[model samples]
Target chain A: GIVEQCCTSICSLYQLENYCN
Target chain B: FVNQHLCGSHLVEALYLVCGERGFFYTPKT
Candidate 1:
């Protein structure tokens, strides 16, 4: 019901490639 | 990458959720 790509991108960008992981 | 779907899937919704949610979804739900 929500967007997951943006969050993942932000996570990967601001954090690390696996930050959101 | 279309209209900032971040506020789009349950996967990111999991980020909003906490232990109360008890785990979450990181999958891009279409």
Candidate 2:
């Protein structure tokens, strides 16, 4: 379980792509 | 409401980890 999450709206395309997958 | 339970709070470094394959977090407890 996760209490808190970390990510940036301006994350690079690669980061967003990998994170979404 | 001093509902004492567990030891401490656990923090997830990545949201993916909390959902995918190896889902886990780092916790500092006593």
Local accuracy by lDDT, each model: 0.41, 0.31
- Model 1 quality (TM-score): 0.25
Chain B TM-score against the true chain B, candidate 1: 0.24
Candidate 1, which segments miss by more than 4 Å at Cα?
A: A1-21, B9-21
Model 2 segments more than 4 A misplaced: A1-9, B1-30
Give the number of the best model, judged by DockQ. 1
lDDT of 1 at B15: 52
Among the numbered candidates, top TM-score falls to 1
Comparing only chain B with the true structure, the TM-scores of all models are: 0.24, 0.18
Would you list the clashing residue pairs of candidate 2? none
- Model 1 residue B18 CA deviation in Å: 4.2
lDDT of 1 at B27: 46
